[PDB]
Design a binder for this molecule. Structure first.
Ligand SMILES: CCOC(=O)C(=O)N[C@@H]1O[C@H](CO)[C@@H](O)[C@H](O)[C@H]1O
Ligand SMILES: CCOC(=O)C(=O)N[C@@H]1O[C@H](CO)[C@@H](O)[C@H](O)[C@H]1O
Ligand SMILES: *Cc1c(COP(=O)(O)O)cnc(C)c1O
Ligand SMILES: *Cc1c(COP(=O)(O)O)cnc(C)c1O
Lengths: 810, 810
């Protein structure tokens, strides 16, 4: 059908069809007379999977032959989404499979909708890991993603009575055709026990053992025949576990619960024992695998030359003391040498500055669960503080501030401090974020070791976030500059010479209209909801959190509604405001914000006077597969976090690459995006980081804004009086109280400027031609935000390896 | 290699080899350079499996077309063992696969040893179900085996310090290539709740739901292209289960524990709630499946014409009230009609007369777990007793004896009484057992409804128990009478005309010697133990139980040892006494018997004076795969249960078919075996059932035997003094006390006759030619014990269907 989707050769289509029928028969044990759509999806999945195996086996054989330096990306989250279409795209099989299935009388897009999302992540941090795996494979790096195979990923969100309801994400129910269990590589992981000091070294004994069974999933590079591996560990009890008889067998569940479910928190630390077990479980199994592979290449001096371990935040921070434990206790290396190796091997990436998100584990927990690691952590701290003391003699407060051990009610271990001390590189995920790390929270560390601190601005993969989700746009682009940009996104800059091209302007606008029509239809299909495709699609999709300020968006929506009610027969640009995202199960305020959003919709969507001029929809169960549908259909991207709180953001990059304009604060990557496209082509508003600081020094008083802004006052009074909750007048009392007395994110402070900026947005939308020309300027300058650029920087500046665009023999 | 193993055609061998390489590559994702023996086993398993699918799909399509009466065999146990070789045998692919793998440079027998046994059973009852499935498929019946897919089957037995240790049987660890999950057919099962009586009928509400997910395994008939299905249910929690958040997800384990593990009891009832849940779980899911299939053919009058439900003991007895519940509560049929249908549909098979084995569930348990079923059971009882009262007016004691409800400390429901009342046929499993049922425990029922009672003597499948485990014997037999006997075992009678054939006599003896050599080698390989292949192999393998009297065997062994020590330089026929079997985890006496056996071995096997004249070995982890090895190697089969306790026995039939002579009591099927072969060709000894009764009426006093038999006295004194337990002198005090004061099985009463009989055995073994001639007379008359004969009788006399030997188009 479309160029970018590859060729549909005669031989290939015929081959695909026969293999499809083979799998339906032999693999699924069914015939066309009883086969259901799900059966057809699996037949197709197994067919595409077969094309991966050959490349997968030789890629791994290749690494064994050349023995390049290996990159190990440790993360407790890998937000992969669906794998079928992505695999076809990277193997250039999309049109062939489309044709083959067509000839079999099946609609491939229908079959793709059957695949369950691999939701092994919460949001940005987990999705970044997924984009990174794609880019590392596309850049020919010998990389391995290591994580946990959660039986249940992020919960499926249901909206009942306007409230969020959570239900288990049993994503493995029908099986996962992409993974390959590798029980032969099962490894033991130890917990509890005690430390015994002998004549020669310490020994960790009387431990409880849990087995780690790996499952491998292929990660195909973009048309370069490279297929890397993502290895996820599953917890299994040993067979002699607890070995009345029946109960002992039933109790195996206790050990296997480690890999049972993903903790559903976004930017929030919950110090639960099960979470700590998950963190050590992944680290312990992974390091044994790493060392095993390293020995199968005694000389640990070359370990850092053959191994790089990237810690995705502090979740896998125990890799530092675990590596020391293995080198010192098991390999018998002296401390100083072991430490040198550890530092040169490990690198740490920080993803947030919010205090409530930082991991600070109670000493009593580590003491009982990992006694040897606690001892190693104390030793690390001692030697580290000795270095601080020597560099800043007499500065006693610096010593207590930099200690890995925090004193107080309960002693805690600051995992971020542990990571900085034991890593040769520490990076933020956006220029402004990395600067904040050096100026504030990690200032002391930066002063001691300035060379360790770096920046690696986030990015997204243009394969899934352009070619896959927006083929129409990828096509009109390829028509004018070729297909090379898909693996070299900077080439989109060539589109700047088409900003005045009447043909291109029309094609860009047409693609957007088609995407909106398709999405508008989807809303009625799976969610029975009517919307006007001619309206401006104003969307904010991301996890629900106070810092992301979905509440500020709500205030604007209510303002628009009140203005219409005030002057009904006055013209206003029609808008469809879409807000979606999940709230952590125990985050009360976040759940109240979801209820408020639906409550507003209940009033706005049924007001005869408003008509089809304003609609407020809450997008249920926002996840990767849904993102692929709504983002290509958006006109306006809401990135309005309080300046200094969103480390980077990545959803923002997705919207920019897909033809939406952005309204946002100078926060995270928004700053670099505006810088790339030109501030005149971005809708920036609100306080800058410096403005927020000035306000805090003076003291934030919400009452002041309430007293001086009539429209704001009205909204607050409507909320308090029960205007949006007739049956429950004080339903939103908590929201109002927070807004008025303890709003850590200064919602009111940016209200006026936000509303004003939104008016400028509506003004430009009234001029289709100019709106589209600005869109072209955004798409054309989004090249810097490809994760291929991000990974190339990690490779050269942190891992010490060169990326390659060379294909491997098929 | 050998005829009976099929042809090794050029086309087939080439095809097998290429498909083997295909699976190794695409399915296992490996190459010959990293593949392990396990990888090769799976490649072969998937290759053979492919040959089953075509036949499987068309067999099921066939039944849908012809719509024959369906047979549903409900059992909580299916002791299947390994599936690879059995599948090759039934598909006539053994030599081809043997050749194909040979050419690939692999030893197929080595790969077969890698497969895990499907140990979803305890012993005889579970193995019978497996043999039955094989025979029903071989006889072309539209049969379905329905059970539970236990995550853990019968525990693996380890012997430590002479004691039995149990370890989890994680048989699914590496995956099961034979099963096919069918999540699309998942069904809900209800528990707890309460009964609500409305205007029209009762309703079962406020129940907890557990999902039943089916897994199908193919059951190939012998070379007739028929492939039936064994459907095993797995427990799954609904996704809204218990839906803080984390705990709710972790608690899903509570529901899924239903299919977690097999209760390890043999002939013993344990009234645990989890077991009751398993019983209802299998019954509820199965009946919905049955009714669904029936409707997909309103007219329930024809239900009995299209459906037959066979209850393997009382474990699935809830099928009776569950069927009534569905017909009355859901389909709205009147009671009388529903009952008529139920009785005509259900048939019950009893497998034991031991009181401790009968299921008697506490009313308070059913009351809480299945409130509606308890009400239905009371109603059934009421109507049944009204019938008894009308047939035997004034006989008030008969009423209390026949009631389904037993009064006393705690009210209980007698499941056997429920089964007889609700079944149109009730059968024992051996002539003597079926007679005992009518004369004793079910006497009252027999008097009320004599027509219901039948006998169906057990049998074993000659495919697994001859062709598969003893190819050498199957071959020399086929050489003289052809291959037809494999599916018509009665033809073995033709071997009687070779009893004087010097060539045959030599071949039979040679096959046995080869089997003994092979097994003798195996003992050293996997268990490092030396044995004399020239000695008589005296074996008793079966679950450890007091009624099976492994203790009587022990007494004989000690007698042999004492006699040797008394006259060292006296000649005695050399023997290797092998005893094996598992003991239920909570059966103390059984565990003590295992310890005694190893203790005896510790003394006997290391006594210089004994030399290689006597060896006592305990066969560890006795299971189906081990049975296939030791039975073909046996010379003497020990079937010495107290007369009237072993309902039938099936191991006895296995030994007879494989060339071993039998020493046993006139119990269970032993009676019919001796009758078939001629008592002169059997070593029968001990009390008959009538003798046991006479002794009980008079009162069994063990002391009498102890006082009048010097050799017995010596053994008891050795046991008590610590002769077999130096460090722990009173270690076997419990055994001696039981033997002397409360032996329910009269071990001493059969001691003298047993020892005498054993002397006659040794005498015949000294004459190789005559021993072999007697063996030939046993093999030649073992035809009646084929499960094909058993199933044909069930088919014609109970299910009302005709067996077929016609092949289906391949
Ligand atoms: C560990 C605490 O961090 C998170 O939960 C988290 O998801 N942080 C997120 O990581 C993304 C990828 O770097 C950033 O773009 C987002 O701004 C940040 O909030
Ligand atoms: C339910 C209680 O019965 C058993 O546990 C059991 O395994 N019984 C066994 O069933 C076999 C097959 O009919 C018979 O041959 C054995 O004699 C009987 O003990
Ligand atoms: C890209 C993505 C995110 C991150 O979005 P931000 O707006 O940067 O927080 C979260 N969830 C999903 C499903 C995503 O695809
Ligand atoms: C045949 C068999 C049984 C039944 O043996 P009996 O001696 O009749 O109790 C038990 N276990 C296994 C593994 C068997 O193969």
């Amino acid at each position: 059908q479309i160029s970018v989707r590859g060729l549909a050769g005669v031989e290939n289509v015929t081959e695909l069809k026969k293999n499809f029928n083979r799998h339906l028969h032999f693999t699924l044990v069914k015939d066309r007379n009883v086969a259901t759509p799900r059966d057809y999806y699996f037949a197709l999945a197994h067919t595409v999977r077969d094309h991966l195996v050959g490349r997968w086996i030789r890629t791994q054989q290749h690494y064994y032959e050349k023995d390049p330096k290996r990159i190990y990306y440790l993360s407790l989250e890998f937000y992969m989404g669906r794998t079928l279409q992505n695999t076809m795209v990277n193997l250039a099989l999309e049109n062939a499979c489309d044709e083959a299935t067509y000839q079999l009388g099946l609609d491939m897009e229908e079959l793709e909708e059957i695949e369950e999302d691999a939701g092994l992540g919460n949001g940005g941090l987990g999705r970044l890991a997924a984009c990174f795996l794609d880019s590392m494979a596309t850049l020919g790096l010998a990389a391995y993603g290591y994580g946990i195979r959660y039986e249940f990923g992020i919960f499926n969100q249901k909206i009942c009575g306007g409230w969020q309801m959570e239900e288990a994400d049993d994503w493995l129910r029908y099986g996962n055709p992409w993974e390959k269990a590798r029980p032969e590589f099962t490894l033991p992981v130890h917990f509890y026990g005690r430390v015994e000091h002998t004549s020669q070294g310490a020994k960790w004994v009387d431990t409880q053992v849990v087995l780690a069974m790996p499952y491998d999933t292929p990660v195909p590079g973009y048309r370069n025949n490279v297929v890397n591996t993502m290895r996820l560990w599953s917890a299994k009890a040993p067979n002699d576990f607890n070995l009345g008889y029946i109960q002992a067998v039933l109790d195996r569940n206790l050990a296997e619960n480690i890999s049972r479910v993903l903790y559903p928190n976004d930017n929030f630390f919950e110090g639960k024992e099960l979470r700590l077990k998950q963190e050590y479980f992944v680290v312990a199994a992974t390091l044994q695998d790493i060392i095993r592979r390293f020995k199968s290449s005694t000389n640990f001096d070359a370990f850092p030359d053959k191994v790089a371990i990237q810690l995705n935040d502090t979740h896998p921070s125990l890799a530092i003391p675990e590596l020391m434990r293995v080198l010192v206790d098991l390999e018998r290396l002296d401390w100083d040498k072991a430490w040198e190796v550890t530092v040169k091997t490990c690198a740490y990436t920080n993803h947030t500055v919010l205090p409530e998100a930082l991991e600070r584990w109670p000493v009593h927990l580590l003491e009982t669960l990992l006694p040897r690691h606690l001892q190693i952590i104390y030793e690390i701290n001692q030697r580290f503080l000795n270095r601080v003391a020597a560099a800043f003699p007499g500065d006693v407060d610096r010593l207590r501030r930099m200690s890995l051990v925090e004193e107080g009610a309960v002693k805690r271990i600051n995992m971020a401090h542990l990571c900085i001390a034991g890593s040769h590189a520490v990076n933020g995920v956006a220029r402004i974020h990395s600067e904040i790390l050096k100026k504030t929270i990690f200032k002391d560390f930066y002063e001691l070791e300035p060379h360790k601190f770096q920046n690696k601005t986030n990015g997204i993969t243009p394969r899934r976030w352009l070619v896959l989700c927006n083929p129409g746009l990828a096509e009109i682009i390829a028509e004018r500059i070729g297909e090379e940009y898909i693996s070299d996104l900077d080439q989109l800059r060539k589109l700047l010479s088409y900003v005045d091209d009447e043909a291109f302007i029309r094609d860009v606008a047409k693609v957007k209209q088609e995407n909106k029509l398709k999405f508008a239809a989807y809303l009625e299909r799976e969610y029975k909801v009517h919307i006007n495709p001619n309206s401006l699609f104003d969307v904010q999709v991301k996890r629900i959190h106070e810092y992301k300020r979905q509440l500020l968006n709500c205030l604007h929506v209510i303002t628009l509604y009140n203005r219409i009610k005030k002057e009904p027969n006055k013209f206003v640009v029609p808008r469809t405001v879409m807000i979606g995202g999940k709230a952590a199960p125990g985050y009360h305020m976040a759940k109240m914000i979801i209820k408020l959003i639906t409550a507003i919709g209940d009033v706005v969507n049924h007001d005869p006077v408003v008509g089809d001029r304003l609609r407020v929809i809450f997008l249920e169960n926002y996840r990767v597969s849904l993102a692929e549908k709504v983002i290509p259909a958006a006109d306006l991207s809401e990135q309005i976090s309080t300046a200094g709180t969103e480390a980077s953001g990545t959803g923002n990059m997705k919207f920019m690459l897909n033809g939406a304009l952005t309204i946002g604060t100078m926060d995270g990557a928004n700053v670099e995006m505006a810088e790339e496209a030109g501030e005149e082509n971005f809708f920036i508003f609100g306080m800058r980081v410096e403005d927020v600081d000035r306000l805090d020094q003076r003291g934030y008083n919400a009452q002041e804004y309430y007293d001086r802004i009539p429209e704001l006052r009205q909204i607050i009074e409507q909320l308090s009086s029960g205007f949006f909750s007739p049956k429950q007048p004080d339903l939103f009392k908590d929201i109002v109280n927070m807004l008025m007395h303890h709003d850590r994110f200064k919602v009111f402070a940016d209200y006026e400027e936000y509303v004003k900026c939104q008016e400028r947005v509506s003004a430009l939308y009234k001029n289709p031609r100019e709106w589209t020309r600005m869109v072209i300027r955004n798409i054309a300058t989004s090249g810097k935000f490809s994760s291929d650029r991000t990974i190339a920087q990690y490779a050269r500046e942190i891992w010490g390896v060169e990326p390659s665009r060379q294909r491997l023999p098929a």
